[PDB]
Amino acid sequence: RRKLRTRRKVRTTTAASGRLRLSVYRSSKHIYAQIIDDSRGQTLAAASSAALKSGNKTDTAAAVGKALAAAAAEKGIKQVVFDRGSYKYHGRVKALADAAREGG
Amino acid sequence: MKIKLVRSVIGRPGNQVKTVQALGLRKIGDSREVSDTPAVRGMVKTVKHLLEVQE
Amino acid sequence: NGRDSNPKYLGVKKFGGEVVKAGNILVRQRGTKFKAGQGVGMGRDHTLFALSDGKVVFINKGKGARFISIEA
Amino acid sequence: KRTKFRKQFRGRMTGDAKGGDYVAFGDYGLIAMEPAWIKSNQIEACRIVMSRHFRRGGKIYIRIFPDKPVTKKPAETRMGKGKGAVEYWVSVVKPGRVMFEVAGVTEEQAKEAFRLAGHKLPIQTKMVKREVYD
RNA sequence: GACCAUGUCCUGUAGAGCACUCACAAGGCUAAAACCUUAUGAAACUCCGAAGGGGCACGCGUUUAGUCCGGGAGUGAGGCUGCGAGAGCUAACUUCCGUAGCCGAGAGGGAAACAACCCAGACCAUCAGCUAAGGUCCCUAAAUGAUCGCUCAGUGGUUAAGGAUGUGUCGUCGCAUAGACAGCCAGGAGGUUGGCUUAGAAGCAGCCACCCUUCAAAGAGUGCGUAAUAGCUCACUGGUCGAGUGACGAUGCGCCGAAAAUGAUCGGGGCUCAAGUGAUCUACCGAAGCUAUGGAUUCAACUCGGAGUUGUCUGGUAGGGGAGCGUU
RNA sequence: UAGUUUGACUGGGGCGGUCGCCUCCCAAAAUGUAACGGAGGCGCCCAAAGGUCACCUCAAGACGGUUGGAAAUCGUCUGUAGAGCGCAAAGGUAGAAGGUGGCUUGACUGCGAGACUGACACGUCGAGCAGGGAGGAAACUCGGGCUUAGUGAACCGGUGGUACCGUGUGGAAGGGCCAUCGAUCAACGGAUAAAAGUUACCCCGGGGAUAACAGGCUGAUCUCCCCCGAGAGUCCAUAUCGGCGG
RNA sequence: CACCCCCGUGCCCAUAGCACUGUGGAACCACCCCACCCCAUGCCGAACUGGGUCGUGAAACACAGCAGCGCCAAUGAUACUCGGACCGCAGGGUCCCGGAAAAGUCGGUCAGCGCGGGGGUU
Ligand SMILES: [Mg+2]
Ligand SMILES: [Mg+2]
Ligand SMILES: [Mg+2]
Ligand SMILES: [Mg+2]
Ligand SMILES: [Mg+2]
Ligand SMILES: [Mg+2]
Ligand SMILES: [Mg+2]
Ligand SMILES: [Mg+2]
Ligand SMILES: [Mg+2]
Ligand SMILES: [Mg+2]
Ligand SMILES: [Mg+2]
Ligand SMILES: [Mg+2]
Ligand SMILES: [Mg+2]
Ligand SMILES: [Mg+2]
Ligand SMILES: [Mg+2]
Ligand SMILES: [Mg+2]
Ligand SMILES: [Mg+2]
Ligand SMILES: [Mg+2]
Ligand SMILES: [Mg+2]
Ligand SMILES: [Mg+2]
Ligand SMILES: [Mg+2]
Ligand SMILES: [Mg+2]
Ligand SMILES: [Mg+2]
Ligand SMILES: [Mg+2]
Ligand SMILES: [Mg+2]
Ligand SMILES: [Mg+2]
Ligand SMILES: [Mg+2]
Ligand SMILES: [Mg+2]
Ligand SMILES: [Mg+2]
Ligand SMILES: [Mg+2]
Ligand SMILES: [Mg+2]
Ligand SMILES: [Mg+2]
Ligand SMILES: [Mg+2]
Ligand SMILES: [Mg+2]
Ligand SMILES: [Mg+2]
Ligand SMILES: [Mg+2]
Ligand SMILES: [Mg+2]
Ligand SMILES: [Mg+2]
Ligand SMILES: [Mg+2]
Ligand SMILES: [Mg+2]
Ligand SMILES: [Mg+2]
Ligand SMILES: [Mg+2]
Ligand SMILES: [Mg+2]
Ligand SMILES: [Mg+2]
Ligand SMILES: [Mg+2]
Ligand SMILES: [Mg+2]
Ligand SMILES: [Mg+2]
Ligand SMILES: [Mg+2]
Ligand SMILES: [Mg+2]
Ligand SMILES: [Mg+2]
Ligand SMILES: [Mg+2]
Ligand SMILES: [Mg+2]
Ligand SMILES: [Mg+2]
């Protein structure tokens, strides 16, 4: 089964560290990748791909990361924890991290 | 509440002995008035078999 | 027979409603009979000691789901 | 009555019965009045005598069973070393716990069957007929 | 500090349950493991799970202890009882732990007597008073007390399995002024000297099975009988008979069961014409406990330059401390 | 010839057994708690069974299947676990501690706030700081192993560093310190470096703290009685005898 | 929190889960789609994974009905027990006061609260 995600999301015990976590959903390339402060039941920085276009999924993903980096920097955030989903750090998601911390 | 010792403390388990002592009757035939406060009302229920509760 | 082994005075060393210094030991256990909540960190033999000074509180739905947090 | 394999030894105590206060299976039955151990052999004698009264019968459940070993110390020995090895098995029998339960035999026949089956027993007992049963 | 109350947390015992492990009770199902209905035990089994118990905090309440630091010790053989376990034989004035209390270190009243049990912790003095346990017939202090019973056994004043038309209190089942239980006369039947048996077994050794006729009236039918039938009785029938009976049951008090060694006994006398008993209620006796008057110490406050007042305290072994008396 | 050694517990001594550490029950729902009480393990292992990063999910059953068939192996369905965890068990564990690879050694040096535990002495856990490493993209995790056994103070010495003492001064001999090695000293807090019997020729000092006798308490065993009643007694349980049980 | 609905991520922590089942469709999600290479399978693009439309709501998933199952679960009555006070030689047991389960019945539920976004009534 997909015991990848409960495992990786129990390994964010370091939400006790105070950093926010950055969920990603390499599914339909919907890769919405929310930023969450877990303590409240609250999310703070959405970046859904509704009509961003940008072409092939591996590069639209980096576009989603570079746009969300601004979308969260507006509110005043910089500590980061990359709560990957079940997905590997394989590239199409790795571009999201590269472009996200390229412009925190 | 009126209280009077009419039982010896001898030979009775030591919680009852420190209970009568803090009640402040050190000898049988002692009496005293007492507050209605639940703390002391339970202090007297604990050793009611030693005392004559009057009120 | 006639053999036996030393006591290991294990337990809930600090009960909920007890202020604790950092590094106080609060539960002793063979394993994770307690699973350590926020502020607490669990050692090698799975004793869990508070990291932060404050009150001790028990999260406890039970059945292996009992956790010890500390509130400042 | 003997238990085919176990762990070796036990202990003892008593308080009133919580398993088998009501009869099933049979027509009539018999109940303890006194707490006690009962040996395998006391059972087997009740079986022998109630099978004497029940020729070609087959209505003899034995709703009790020697579970507990009890181990006397050997010949003449001063104390020291274990409980020897088990000398006989016994069944705890607290009051109100049924022992016996017949069917298919008329009231006075079961009544005599229970007379003899109790007289070999080390306890008071009583015959009962079933009706206040859920 | 200590007890007690509130708040909170932690626990896996009693109990209780089979959901796992071992065990185990009657069946159905089936190449029997498995499975289902039903049924159970478990120190090393737990789906559960109190009472209590421990830590914290408060004191929202009565009390007086505690903590550390320095001098001196002794003790490191425990004993019983009750509760909870182990070991034992559910033995022991047994042995080993937990726990409470007494004894050790404890006087006084009770238990005839008696470290441990029940009452009650002795500062001193009194020819003063109330009580505790326990008592009130004489010994022997104090009701031959009162009221409803219970037991006629000296039970009381030594056990049990088991028996008993012993006796009260309720209580369940039948058949009766269309007249029953014992109780007297009257009948005892039919194939049938019934199948199944050993050598004969024929109400009436005994394994297997009980229907059918003639009847106001009787079961191929009870215990006896010689080895078999008769034989006197019985279960239904009847003139009489004239009113209750018989059954298992719960129980209260008793009987038997119930033999040991120098001489008997409840402590003794004696007790039912209660001095036994269960239920109630008083009235008094009854301690070195409590109260009264007097008296002195330990401590502490309170006053004057140990004294005195008020409170309080004063059983005591090893021991620690303190004030003093006697001899050279 | 001589001076000595020759262990303790022990329902009396001897014999047998035991002596240290771990697990469970006893242990009476805190911690603790005895027994020659009931059960069983340890005197090690692992260059990866570590650190880290990443990835898989186990028994067992049924239907189906090649030489195998109750159980090799593959295939489907059910499958909070009925498996596994190096050895014993309890706890624990399914988001892993179980299984499988890549990298490397934190199986580091210097420290230790705070506590748990113990009469001590030992023992346990431990956040975070330095120097510097290792894995990861990072958060982060590493100063051994899921945990609890795998162990012995102190003395006297071996080996490598270091440059403190080193006797008049300079050196060296020797010593100190840091590291490490030598222990069934297992009677496992460990009397010496170095040790067995025997006494009925016995002697002393003690003990009813403790056996042989006798009394006592108990009454398993012993002696006796009673209940039942199977059968024996042709017949008929009880004239006698009375199984198995109480 | 205008009304629904979807993707995700929390709190909760079986009264939320199972099964039977019906709705769902290019809006969302999901399989199918191809593989020399990023990247990978101790064999397989099944899994990760990279390049995408059709197709299809089949399967999975979401959401409703659903009391066969599970899950919860009284009251009442006990068991037991703190203190008090008793009987039995003994195993054992009783009484007064107060605390009081477990099992079972009665009955309850196929949940309940957020946060961000996506597309709807245009
Ligand atoms: Mg018990
Ligand atoms: Mg039951
Ligand atoms: Mg043994
Ligand atoms: Mg206080
Ligand atoms: Mg039990
Ligand atoms: Mg306790
Ligand atoms: Mg305060
Ligand atoms: Mg001192
Ligand atoms: Mg001693
Ligand atoms: Mg003792
Ligand atoms: Mg025994
Ligand atoms: Mg003794
Ligand atoms: Mg002794
Ligand atoms: Mg003494
Ligand atoms: Mg004393
Ligand atoms: Mg006395
Ligand atoms: Mg006496
Ligand atoms: Mg006298
Ligand atoms: Mg004496
Ligand atoms: Mg004396
Ligand atoms: Mg005595
Ligand atoms: Mg008394
Ligand atoms: Mg008087
Ligand atoms: Mg009186
Ligand atoms: Mg007189
Ligand atoms: Mg009797
Ligand atoms: Mg009179
Ligand atoms: Mg009077
Ligand atoms: Mg007097
Ligand atoms: Mg006096
Ligand atoms: Mg005076
Ligand atoms: Mg004194
Ligand atoms: Mg005094
Ligand atoms: Mg004195
Ligand atoms: Mg010796
Ligand atoms: Mg304990
Ligand atoms: Mg002791
Ligand atoms: Mg791991
Ligand atoms: Mg650290
Ligand atoms: Mg570092
Ligand atoms: Mg790196
Ligand atoms: Mg050297
Ligand atoms: Mg030596
Ligand atoms: Mg030693
Ligand atoms: Mg000589
Ligand atoms: Mg002497
Ligand atoms: Mg002696
Ligand atoms: Mg002797
Ligand atoms: Mg002899
Ligand atoms: Mg109730
Ligand atoms: Mg009470
Ligand atoms: Mg009690
Ligand atoms: Mg009650």
Residues with their C more than 2.5 Å from the N of the next written residue in chain B, i.e. before a break, are none
Subunits with 3+ C-beta pairs closer than 8 A to D: none
- On the 0-12 / 13-18 / 19+ scale of CB atoms within 10 A, D70 is middle
Q: Give me the domain span that covers residue C37.
A: 10-72
Residue D106 and residue D84: Cα distance in Å, rounded? Answer: 47
Q: Give the bridge partners for A58, in sequence order.
A: none
Q: How many structural domains are present in chain B?
A: 1
User: What domain range is B7 assigned to?
Assistant: 1-55
**Dist. CA B3 → ligand 32 center (Å):** 27
Residue D17 CA to ligand 50 centre (angstroms): 22
Q: Please check whether residue C2 lies inside any domain of the structure.
A: no
Q: How many Å apart are CA A55 and CA D76, to the nearest integer? A: 99
Is residue C36 a part of any domain in this protein?
yes
What distance in Å separates the CA atoms of residue D8 and residue D2, rounded to the nearest whole number? 13
To 5 degrees, how large is the angle CA C33–CA C37–CA C42? Answer: 60
Among residues A19, A66, A83, A75, which one has the least CA distance to residue A45? A75
Nearest ligand, CA B10: 15
Give the method of determination. X-ray
Tally of structural domains, chain A:
1
Contacts of residue D41, defined as CB under 8 A and 6 or more positions apart, other chains included, come to: D1, D88
D17 CB-to-strand G distance under 7 Å = no
A28 CB neighbours strand G below 7 A: yes
Window 7-66 of chain D: CB closer than 7 A to strand E? 7-22, 24-25, 55-56, 61-63, 65
Token pair listed for A2: 């997909």
Contacts of C65 (CB under 8 A, 6+ apart): C35
Both tokens assigned to D12 = 């003892």
Number of other CB atoms surrounding residue B20 within 10 Å: 25
Q: Read off the tokens for B38.
A: 């639940």
Q: How far is the CA of D60 from the C1' of E26 (A)?
A: 10
Instruction: Answer whether any strand E atom is within 7 A of the Cβ of B26.
Output: yes
**What distance in angstroms lies between residue D95's CA and the mean position of ligand 2's atoms?**
15
Per the domain annotation, does A77 fall within a domain?
yes
Whether residue C53 is contained in a domain is answered as: yes
Ion ligand 2, residue ranges at CB < 5 A: D 19
